[PDB]
Design an enzyme around this catalytic site. Structure first.
Site, PDB file in Angstrom:
ATOM      1  N   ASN A  17       9.092   5.614  23.182  1.00  0.00           N
ATOM      2  CA  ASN A  17      10.166   6.701  23.659  1.00  0.00           C
ATOM      3  C   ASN A  17      11.006   5.830  24.402  1.00  0.00           C
ATOM      4  N   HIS A  45       0.399  11.943  27.945  1.00  0.00           N
ATOM      5  CA  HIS A  45      -0.187  11.431  26.558  1.00  0.00           C
ATOM      6  C   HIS A  45       0.489   9.861  25.949  1.00  0.00           C
ATOM      7  N   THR A  72       6.189  11.654  21.395  1.00  0.00           N
ATOM      8  CA  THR A  72       6.638  12.600  20.389  1.00  0.00           C
ATOM      9  C   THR A  72       7.614  11.865  19.357  1.00  0.00           C
ATOM     10  N   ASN A 106       1.177 -13.305   9.582  1.00  0.00           N
ATOM     11  CA  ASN A 106       2.497 -12.673   9.979  1.00  0.00           C
ATOM     12  C   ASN A 106       2.094 -11.206  10.437  1.00  0.00           C
ATOM     13  N   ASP A 138       1.643  -8.347   9.232  1.00  0.00           N
ATOM     14  CA  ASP A 138       2.389  -7.078   8.758  1.00  0.00           C
ATOM     15  C   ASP A 138       1.282  -6.396   8.068  1.00  0.00           C
TER      16      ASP A 138
HETATM   17  C1  LIG Z   1       4.001   1.060   5.140  1.00  0.00           C
HETATM   18  O1  LIG Z   1       4.668   1.383   3.929  1.00  0.00           O
HETATM   19  C2  LIG Z   1       5.925   0.670   3.993  1.00  0.00           C
HETATM   20  C3  LIG Z   1       6.841   1.242   2.985  1.00  0.00           C
HETATM   21  O2  LIG Z   1       6.346   1.151   1.455  1.00  0.00           O
HETATM   22  C4  LIG Z   1       5.770  -0.921   3.613  1.00  0.00           C
HETATM   23  O3  LIG Z   1       7.138  -1.603   4.091  1.00  0.00           O
HETATM   24  C5  LIG Z   1       7.693  -1.974   3.025  1.00  0.00           C
HETATM   25  O4  LIG Z   1       7.005  -3.261   2.891  1.00  0.00           O
HETATM   26  C6  LIG Z   1       7.708  -4.137   1.624  1.00  0.00           C
HETATM   27  C7  LIG Z   1       7.071  -5.652   1.756  1.00  0.00           C
HETATM   28  O5  LIG Z   1       7.068  -6.265   3.003  1.00  0.00           O
HETATM   29  C8  LIG Z   1       9.273  -4.341   2.195  1.00  0.00           C
HETATM   30  O6  LIG Z   1      10.084  -4.972   1.004  1.00  0.00           O
HETATM   31  C9  LIG Z   1      10.910  -5.930   1.405  1.00  0.00           C
HETATM   32  O7  LIG Z   1      12.192  -5.412   1.611  1.00  0.00           O
HETATM   33  C10 LIG Z   1      13.495  -6.187   1.798  1.00  0.00           C
HETATM   34  C11 LIG Z   1      14.719  -5.206   1.699  1.00  0.00           C
HETATM   35  O8  LIG Z   1      14.271  -4.210   2.790  1.00  0.00           O
HETATM   36  C12 LIG Z   1      15.503  -3.289   2.931  1.00  0.00           C
HETATM   37  O9  LIG Z   1      15.362  -2.106   1.970  1.00  0.00           O
HETATM   38  C13 LIG Z   1      14.279  -1.283   2.134  1.00  0.00           C
HETATM   39  C14 LIG Z   1      14.624  -0.326   1.118  1.00  0.00           C
HETATM   40  O10 LIG Z   1      15.626   0.589   1.364  1.00  0.00           O
HETATM   41  C15 LIG Z   1      14.308  -0.625   3.473  1.00  0.00           C
HETATM   42  O11 LIG Z   1      13.278   0.209   3.526  1.00  0.00           O
HETATM   43  C16 LIG Z   1      13.974  -1.848   4.889  1.00  0.00           C
HETATM   44  O12 LIG Z   1      14.125  -1.124   5.769  1.00  0.00           O
HETATM   45  C17 LIG Z   1      13.497  -2.042   7.026  1.00  0.00           C
HETATM   46  O13 LIG Z   1      14.211  -2.690   7.706  1.00  0.00           O
HETATM   47  C18 LIG Z   1      15.538  -2.042   8.389  1.00  0.00           C
HETATM   48  C19 LIG Z   1      16.339  -2.953   9.079  1.00  0.00           C
HETATM   49  O14 LIG Z   1      15.727  -4.139   9.792  1.00  0.00           O
HETATM   50  C20 LIG Z   1      14.775  -0.894   9.130  1.00  0.00           C
HETATM   51  O15 LIG Z   1      15.844  -0.137   9.539  1.00  0.00           O
HETATM   52  C21 LIG Z   1      13.593  -0.330   8.710  1.00  0.00           C
HETATM   53  O16 LIG Z   1      12.979   0.316   9.712  1.00  0.00           O
HETATM   54  C22 LIG Z   1      12.411  -1.389   7.959  1.00  0.00           C
HETATM   55  O17 LIG Z   1      11.901  -2.129   8.996  1.00  0.00           O
HETATM   56  C23 LIG Z   1      10.879  -2.619   8.564  1.00  0.00           C
HETATM   57  O18 LIG Z   1      10.464  -3.291   7.438  1.00  0.00           O
HETATM   58  C24 LIG Z   1      10.874  -4.619   7.490  1.00  0.00           C
HETATM   59  C25 LIG Z   1      10.538  -5.643   6.350  1.00  0.00           C
HETATM   60  O19 LIG Z   1      11.638  -5.294   5.355  1.00  0.00           O
HETATM   61  C26 LIG Z   1      10.310  -5.277   8.854  1.00  0.00           C
HETATM   62  O20 LIG Z   1      11.066  -6.650   9.102  1.00  0.00           O
HETATM   63  C27 LIG Z   1      10.571  -4.396  10.215  1.00  0.00           C
HETATM   64  O21 LIG Z   1       9.799  -5.117  11.237  1.00  0.00           O
HETATM   65  C28 LIG Z   1      10.183  -2.999   9.929  1.00  0.00           C
HETATM   66  O22 LIG Z   1       8.719  -3.194   9.877  1.00  0.00           O
HETATM   67  C29 LIG Z   1      15.528  -2.715   4.559  1.00  0.00           C
HETATM   68  O23 LIG Z   1      16.585  -2.290   4.922  1.00  0.00           O
HETATM   69  C30 LIG Z   1      13.292  -7.390   0.661  1.00  0.00           C
HETATM   70  O24 LIG Z   1      14.701  -8.059   1.153  1.00  0.00           O
HETATM   71  C31 LIG Z   1      11.910  -8.150   0.785  1.00  0.00           C
HETATM   72  O25 LIG Z   1      12.141  -9.154  -0.101  1.00  0.00           O
HETATM   73  C32 LIG Z   1      11.745 -10.464   0.421  1.00  0.00           C
HETATM   74  O26 LIG Z   1      10.490 -10.721   0.106  1.00  0.00           O
HETATM   75  C33 LIG Z   1      10.116 -10.880  -1.259  1.00  0.00           C
HETATM   76  C34 LIG Z   1       8.683 -11.190  -1.289  1.00  0.00           C
HETATM   77  O27 LIG Z   1       8.155 -10.727  -2.553  1.00  0.00           O
HETATM   78  C35 LIG Z   1      10.960 -11.858  -1.965  1.00  0.00           C
HETATM   79  O28 LIG Z   1      10.626 -11.439  -3.523  1.00  0.00           O
HETATM   80  C36 LIG Z   1      12.303 -11.721  -1.659  1.00  0.00           C
HETATM   81  O29 LIG Z   1      13.111 -12.966  -2.164  1.00  0.00           O
HETATM   82  C37 LIG Z   1      12.744 -11.544  -0.357  1.00  0.00           C
HETATM   83  O30 LIG Z   1      12.641 -12.872   0.620  1.00  0.00           O
HETATM   84  C38 LIG Z   1      13.617 -13.309   1.078  1.00  0.00           C
HETATM   85  O31 LIG Z   1      13.746 -12.808   2.517  1.00  0.00           O
HETATM   86  C39 LIG Z   1      12.740 -13.499   3.315  1.00  0.00           C
HETATM   87  C40 LIG Z   1      12.768 -12.961   4.782  1.00  0.00           C
HETATM   88  O32 LIG Z   1      14.286 -12.477   4.933  1.00  0.00           O
HETATM   89  C41 LIG Z   1      12.802 -14.894   3.332  1.00  0.00           C
HETATM   90  O33 LIG Z   1      11.995 -15.734   3.794  1.00  0.00           O
HETATM   91  C42 LIG Z   1      13.033 -15.429   1.923  1.00  0.00           C
HETATM   92  O34 LIG Z   1      13.152 -16.988   1.988  1.00  0.00           O
HETATM   93  C43 LIG Z   1      13.842 -14.870   0.944  1.00  0.00           C
HETATM   94  O35 LIG Z   1      15.322 -15.041   1.477  1.00  0.00           O
HETATM   95  C44 LIG Z   1      11.018  -7.171   0.594  1.00  0.00           C
HETATM   96  O36 LIG Z   1      10.514  -6.870  -0.634  1.00  0.00           O
HETATM   97  C45 LIG Z   1       9.784  -3.101   2.411  1.00  0.00           C
HETATM   98  O37 LIG Z   1      11.108  -3.302   2.937  1.00  0.00           O
HETATM   99  C46 LIG Z   1       9.067  -2.278   3.768  1.00  0.00           C
HETATM  100  N1  LIG Z   1       9.706  -0.914   3.996  1.00  0.00           N
HETATM  101  C47 LIG Z   1       9.726  -0.424   4.843  1.00  0.00           C
HETATM  102  C48 LIG Z   1      10.276   0.982   5.130  1.00  0.00           C
HETATM  103  O38 LIG Z   1       9.321  -0.802   5.953  1.00  0.00           O
HETATM  104  C49 LIG Z   1       4.648  -1.515   4.542  1.00  0.00           C
HETATM  105  O39 LIG Z   1       4.140  -2.600   4.133  1.00  0.00           O
HETATM  106  C50 LIG Z   1       3.362  -0.430   4.789  1.00  0.00           C
HETATM  107  N2  LIG Z   1       2.479  -0.869   5.511  1.00  0.00           N
HETATM  108  C51 LIG Z   1       1.210  -1.104   5.318  1.00  0.00           C
HETATM  109  C52 LIG Z   1       0.161  -1.753   6.371  1.00  0.00           C
HETATM  110  O40 LIG Z   1       0.818  -0.859   4.202  1.00  0.00           O
HETATM  111  N1  XRN Z   2      18.160  15.840  25.887  1.00  0.00           N
HETATM  112  S1  XRN Z   2      16.887  15.886  26.740  1.00  0.00           S
HETATM  113  O1  XRN Z   2      16.681  17.115  26.935  1.00  0.00           O
HETATM  114  O2  XRN Z   2      17.198  14.785  27.906  1.00  0.00           O
HETATM  115  C1  XRN Z   2      15.770  15.070  25.667  1.00  0.00           C
HETATM  116  C2  XRN Z   2      15.923  15.078  24.367  1.00  0.00           C
HETATM  117  C3  XRN Z   2      15.100  14.644  23.451  1.00  0.00           C
HETATM  118  N2  XRN Z   2      13.844  15.360  23.621  1.00  0.00           N
HETATM  119  C4  XRN Z   2      12.763  15.420  22.808  1.00  0.00           C
HETATM  120  O3  XRN Z   2      11.623  14.953  23.001  1.00  0.00           O
HETATM  121  N3  XRN Z   2      12.940  16.093  21.596  1.00  0.00           N
HETATM  122  C5  XRN Z   2      14.074  16.791  21.210  1.00  0.00           C
HETATM  123  C6  XRN Z   2      13.559  17.730  20.341  1.00  0.00           C
HETATM  124  C7  XRN Z   2      14.402  18.493  19.013  1.00  0.00           C
HETATM  125  N4  XRN Z   2      13.648  18.339  17.959  1.00  0.00           N
HETATM  126  C8  XRN Z   2      13.218  18.951  17.010  1.00  0.00           C
HETATM  127  O4  XRN Z   2      14.098  20.150  16.532  1.00  0.00           O
HETATM  128  O5  XRN Z   2      12.293  18.611  15.878  1.00  0.00           O
HETATM  129  C9  XRN Z   2      12.144  19.509  14.874  1.00  0.00           C
HETATM  130  C10 XRN Z   2      11.408  18.761  13.861  1.00  0.00           C
HETATM  131  C11 XRN Z   2      11.268  17.179  13.937  1.00  0.00           C
HETATM  132  C12 XRN Z   2      10.609  16.555  12.918  1.00  0.00           C
HETATM  133  C13 XRN Z   2      10.001  17.243  11.804  1.00  0.00           C
HETATM  134  O6  XRN Z   2       9.011  16.445  10.902  1.00  0.00           O
HETATM  135  C14 XRN Z   2       8.417  16.773   9.810  1.00  0.00           C
HETATM  136  F1  XRN Z   2       9.240  16.454   8.769  1.00  0.00           F
HETATM  137  F2  XRN Z   2       8.435  18.260   9.558  1.00  0.00           F
HETATM  138  F3  XRN Z   2       7.302  16.481   9.394  1.00  0.00           F
HETATM  139  C15 XRN Z   2       9.963  18.566  11.868  1.00  0.00           C
HETATM  140  C16 XRN Z   2      10.471  19.290  12.817  1.00  0.00           C
HETATM  141  C17 XRN Z   2      12.467  17.246  18.126  1.00  0.00           C
HETATM  142  C18 XRN Z   2      12.916  16.494  19.340  1.00  0.00           C
HETATM  143  C19 XRN Z   2      12.081  15.599  20.384  1.00  0.00           C
HETATM  144  C20 XRN Z   2      13.289  15.507  25.080  1.00  0.00           C
HETATM  145  C21 XRN Z   2      14.293  15.639  26.114  1.00  0.00           C
HETATM  146 CA    CA Z   3       5.411  15.321  22.056  1.00  0.00          CA
END
Ligand SMILES: *[C@@H]1O[C@H](CO)[C@@H](O[C@@H]2O[C@H](CO)[C@@H](O[C@@H]3O[C@H](CO[C@H]4O[C@H](CO)[C@@H](O)[C@H](O[C@H]5O[C@H](CO)[C@@H](O)[C@H](O)[C@@H]5O[C@H]5O[C@H](CO)[C@@H](O)[C@H](O)[C@@H]5O)[C@@H]4O)[C@@H](O)[C@H](O[C@H]4O[C@H](CO)[C@@H](O)[C@H](O)[C@@H]4O[C@H]4O[C@H](CO)[C@@H](O)[C@H](O)[C@@H]4O)[C@@H]3O)[C@H](O)[C@H]2NC(C)=O)[C@H](O)[C@H]1NC(C)=O
Ligand code: XRN
Ligand code: CA
Ligand code: CA
Ligand code: CL
Ligand code: NA
Ligand code: NA
Ligand code: ZN
Length: 806
Positions: A180, A420, A159, A685, A687
């Site tokens: 989950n 599922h 979910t 890596n 990715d």
């Molecule tokens: C699917 O689509 C998505 C979205 O477009 C693609 O993902 C993007 O890919 C980009 C390239 O990898 C990546 O860009 C990097 O961003 C870094 C900054 O990132 C932060 O800010 C963004 C923007 O707000 C944010 O979205 C990020 O959020 C990630 O991390 C947080 C916290 O961990 C999570 O909450 C979140 O879920 C998300 O995690 C995911 O992505 C990260 C990688 O960013 C993974 O590690 C996780 O597992 C997870 O998958 C961040 O908050 C930026 O710093 C990077 O720049 C580095 O690399 C470039 C190379 O060009 C270089 O120029 C820079 O110098 C820098 O290098 C330095 O850091 C290195 C490592 O620390 C180090 O080795 C070097 O020495 C340097 O110090 C980079 O630009 C982008 O963040 C993600 N976005 C998302 C949302 O995931 C994805 O590729 C697609 N998939 C496919 C298959 O197509």
């Molecule tokens: N608290 S609990 O009963 O133990 C436990 C809590 C968590 N639970 C559990 O599966 N969910 C509690 C539910 C209430 N949510 C909800 O209102 O979702 C609406 C929604 C979400 C995304 C959307 O995405 C978008 F953008 F439209 F594409 C749109 C609409 C979904 C949550 C899943 C399982 C049971």
């Molecule tokens: Ca479900």
């Protein structure tokens, strides 16, 4: 702390969340133990139920009632949804004939058609046909609007990963909601279905639709509904929000139903008890549509009816136990059920070894119902590896089964009949999509598509710029009447060199040999033309792929194939060839078995060498264009060029040779010719994106020849198979794969048998979209066709699944 002394008076289902310890009146306060004292009394009224009756018509407003049938209810925006039906002689929405919505027909002050997302949990794709008798409102949405036969969820098919993928357009590995249940080693924190930690913002990555909207000045209803708010109240609350003044009214809304999933777990996907939940869901849709009709919004609002995943038959007796395989069972933590994730129980235990765990889990029992993987070896189409919350060891569980650590976990934790979470290609996991409204097409069926694509379309529907995501924007333009997104093709970054003959044979010292020194202006002028590209129109059907990164590469032409050869990686990035239905398979002549020939167009310094393969006791080599499909004995010499060679483990050569010798010709026979593009992939890596040179972890011993992690092929032909692949005048048909380049065939339990018993099954498991290959290679395919770009984007997102009919 919450000081619940404040009052929800006039604040019921307020859209902005007040900061504690102020008491909340929003549809989430219940979840936070933070509602005001009078929330139930004022906000969750139930008196008199949900429907008007004849005798309630024209009543004196009684504010206690759940909804209203008094004369002022329409302008108050709080009538029961059947008010005009019971009291004003109106018909139910479902009873009205379908009529095309060519333009939005909206009340004054609406800046744009509102979007309502009506999401249903566990709604399996085949319910649309199998429950159609008891779902008239849904069936009207479906037949009148735009629908797909099914929509593919993301893995794991649970979910939260799927709803959040719908919201963000991102794979779970990128958005961070990878199951989950989760442990994040950096936070040292756990995420659980029940509980409070799941609300912490650090779990939720990317940018979901409601934030995208808000940042761009489009107001959103709240997406999450607390479990105790009944469905009727959810609908009434949406309808009330739609009656707000223009400046306060949201443009996007969500409804969620925990059904049919809830009952599906208890009774199985087709239990007789399942009829009732489907009826009740349909009645809720009816209430929405009748309510929109009362508000004059039924030809204004875009409605999306969407599920998160399907449901499969699964019972307690179909559970595999890790205690039947491992001696060391108590030194591991398992995330169990329809997938498995394994890690060490204690990080201080240095006797823990993933390699021995994988081995004890591999092909140990005749009908074993799970397969272990290191996460980087999972099918690339799952995109399930690039996150620290995904454990290195993964179990892919067969449909209909569970995995658990020990039997005690199952009987001290049969109850359930459904579950599922399985591989997202499994038919029972497929779910639904219907789009209905002015922006969707009328009475239109579209091909199945992945749920990652919808964020882009929802942004399009609201005039929003989507945040970066994993959808391919434009691939779903064919769902829309208007608001299409018209992308341009990416610009090529590197232009190829076109080398001629520049090197004498003796300049090469590669340790290669070929028995080829066996010697006429007929075939001499002829071979010059072939090296200049005279048959390129036959073998390169859709233009050359564009290289979207900075690199140095050469186009090499040959009679039977064309290649883009990387001077950096020392092998082709791609090799393109066409095999007609009439083509013949030949064998490699005895004298040519180990023949490798220097390419006089390409310097020794930018070539592979045979000595490295001799010295590397683990690594052998294969060819991208197969010598078996050569058009003539003379053309065959081209196939042994050192520029057509790639590094291959012997175990992998078994797979590759069967594909090249047996399967390509089989496909050409079946599909009336095929065009094939093959090449290497480097993703050390994991990715899902092309590695740079400095990311390569393995080379052919003693050389600078990098070892691919994967090999791909894209196989294209005419959708109308009465036309040959090389003379196709309309739409194309594609299937692709990304095969892991592994030094063993441990993945395939029957690999000691003939390739005819196991190779095709492996290839099916590793089916891929062209788009997946694009990401992994930095290449852009289908640049020159007679097709519209949106149609090509759809083709590039196509996945050939090998599942039977839904
Ligand atoms: C699917 O689509 C998505 C979205 O477009 C693609 O993902 C993007 O890919 C980009 C390239 O990898 C990546 O860009 C990097 O961003 C870094 C900054 O990132 C932060 O800010 C963004 C923007 O707000 C944010 O979205 C990020 O959020 C990630 O991390 C947080 C916290 O961990 C999570 O909450 C979140 O879920 C998300 O995690 C995911 O992505 C990260 C990688 O960013 C993974 O590690 C996780 O597992 C997870 O998958 C961040 O908050 C930026 O710093 C990077 O720049 C580095 O690399 C470039 C190379 O060009 C270089 O120029 C820079 O110098 C820098 O290098 C330095 O850091 C290195 C490592 O620390 C180090 O080795 C070097 O020495 C340097 O110090 C980079 O630009 C982008 O963040 C993600 N976005 C998302 C949302 O995931 C994805 O590729 C697609 N998939 C496919 C298959 O197509
Ligand atoms: N608290 S609990 O009963 O133990 C436990 C809590 C968590 N639970 C559990 O599966 N969910 C509690 C539910 C209430 N949510 C909800 O209102 O979702 C609406 C929604 C979400 C995304 C959307 O995405 C978008 F953008 F439209 F594409 C749109 C609409 C979904 C949550 C899943 C399982 C049971
Ligand atoms: Ca479900
Ligand atoms: Ca990579
Ligand atoms: Cl999970
Ligand atoms: Na070798
Ligand atoms: Na094997
Ligand atoms: Zn469920």
């Amino acid at each position: 702390w919450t000081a619940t002394s404040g009052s929800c008076k006039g604040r019921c289902f307020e859209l902005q969340e007040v900061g504690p310890p102020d008491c909340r009146c929003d549809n989430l306060c219940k979840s936070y133990s933070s509602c005001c004292h009078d929330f139930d009394e004022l906000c969750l009224k139930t008196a008199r139920g949900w429907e008007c009756t004849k005798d309630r018509c024209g009543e004196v407003r009684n504010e206690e009632n759940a909804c209203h049938c008094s004369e002022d209810c329409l302008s108050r925006g709080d009538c029961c949804t059947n008010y005009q039906v019971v009291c004003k002689g109106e018909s139910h929405w479902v009873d009205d004939d379908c009529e095309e919505i060519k333009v939005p027909e909206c009340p004054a002050g609406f800046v744009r058609p509102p979007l309502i997302i009506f999401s249903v949990d566990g709604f399996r794709a085949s319910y649309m046909k199998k429950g159609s008798k008891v779902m008239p409102n849904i069936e009207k949405l479906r037949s009148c609007g735009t629908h797909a036969p099914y929509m593919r969820p993301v893995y794991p098919t649970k979910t939260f990963p799927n709803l959040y993928t719908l919201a963000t357009g991102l794979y779970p590995e990128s958005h961070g909601i990878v199951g989950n249940s989760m442990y994040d080693p950096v936070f040292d924190a756990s995420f659980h279905l029940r509980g409070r930690e799941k609300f912490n913002h650090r779990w939720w990555g990317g940018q979901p639709l409601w934030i995208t909207a808000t940042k761009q000045g489009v107001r959103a209803g709240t997406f999450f509904w607390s479990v105790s708010i009944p469905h009727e109240r959810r609908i009434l609350t949406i309808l009330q929000w739609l009656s707000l003044p223009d400046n306060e009214r949201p443009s996007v809304y969500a409804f969620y139903s925990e059904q049919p999933d809830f009952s599906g777990h208890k009774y199985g996907p087709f239990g007789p008890e399942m009829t009732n939940p489907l009826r009740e869901i349909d009645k809720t849709v009816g209430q929405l549509m009748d309510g929109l009709k009362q508000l004059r919004l039924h030809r204004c609002v875009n409605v999306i009816f969407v599920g998160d995943h399907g449901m499969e038959d699964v019972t307690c007796d179909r559970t595999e136990f890790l205690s039947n395989y491992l001696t060391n069972v108590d030194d591991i933590t398992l995330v169990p059920g329809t997938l498995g994730r394994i890690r060490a129980k204690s990080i201080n235990n240095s006797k823990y070894d993933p390699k021995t765990i994988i081995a004890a889990l591999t092909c140990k029992k005749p009908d074993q119902h799970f397969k272990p993987y290191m996460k980087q070896h999972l099918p690339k189409r799952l995109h399930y590896a690039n996150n620290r919350r995904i454990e290195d060891i993964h179990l892919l569980v067969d449909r209909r089964w569970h995995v658990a650590r020990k039997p005690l976990d199952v009987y001290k934790k049969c109850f359930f009949q459904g579950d599922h979470g399985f591989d997202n290609k499994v038919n029972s996991m497929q779910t639904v999509f219907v789009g209905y409204g002015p922006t969707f097409k009328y009475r239109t069926k579209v091909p199945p598509f992945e749920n990652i694509e919808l964020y882009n379309v929802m942004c399009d529907l609201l005039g929003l710029k989507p945040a970066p995501n994993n959808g391919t924007h434009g691939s779903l333009n064919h769902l829309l009447r208007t608001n299409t997104f018209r992308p341009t093709m990416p610009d090529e970054v590197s232009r190829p060199n076109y080398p001629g003959i520049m090197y004498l044979q003796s300049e090469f010292d590669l340790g290669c040999t070929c028995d080829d020194k066996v010697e006429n202006k007929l075939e001499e002028l002829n071979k010059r033309l072939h090296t200049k590209g005279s048959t390129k129109e036959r073998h390169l059907l859709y233009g050359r792929p564009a290289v979207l990164y900075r690199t140095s590469y050469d186009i090499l032409y040959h009679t039977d194939f064309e290649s883009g050869y990387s001077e950096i990686f020392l092998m082709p990035l791609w090799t393109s060839y066409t095999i007609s239905k009439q083509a013949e398979v030949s064998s490699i002549p005895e004298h040519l078995t180990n023949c490798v020939r220097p390419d006089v167009r390409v310097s020794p310094g930018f070539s592979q060498n045979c000595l490295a393969y001799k010295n590397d006791k683990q690594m052998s080599y294969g060819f991208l264009f197969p010598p078996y499909l050569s058009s003539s004995p003379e053309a065959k010499y081209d196939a042994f060029l050192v520029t057509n060679m790639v590094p291959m483990y012997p175990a992998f050569k078994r797979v590759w040779a069967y594909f090249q010798r047996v399967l390509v010709k089989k496909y050409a026979s079946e599909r009336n010719g095929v065009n094939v593009i093959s090449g290497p992939i480097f993703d050390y890596n994991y990715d899902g994106l092309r590695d740079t040179e400095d990311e390569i972890k393995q080379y052919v011993e003693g050389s600078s020849i990098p070892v691919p992690t994967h090999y791909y092929s894209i196989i294209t032909s005419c959708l109308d198979f009465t036309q040959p692949a090389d003379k196709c005048d309309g739409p194309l048909s594609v299937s692709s794969f990304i095969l892991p380049h592994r030094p063993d065939n441990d993945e395939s339990c029957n690999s000691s048998e003939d390739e005819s018993k196991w190779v095709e099954e492996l290839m099916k498991m590793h089916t891929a979209r062209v788009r997946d290959i694009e990401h992994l290679t930095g290449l852009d395919f289908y640049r020159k066709t007679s097709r519209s770009y949106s149609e090509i984007l759809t083709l590039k997102t196509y996945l050939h699944t090998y599942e039977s009919e839904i």
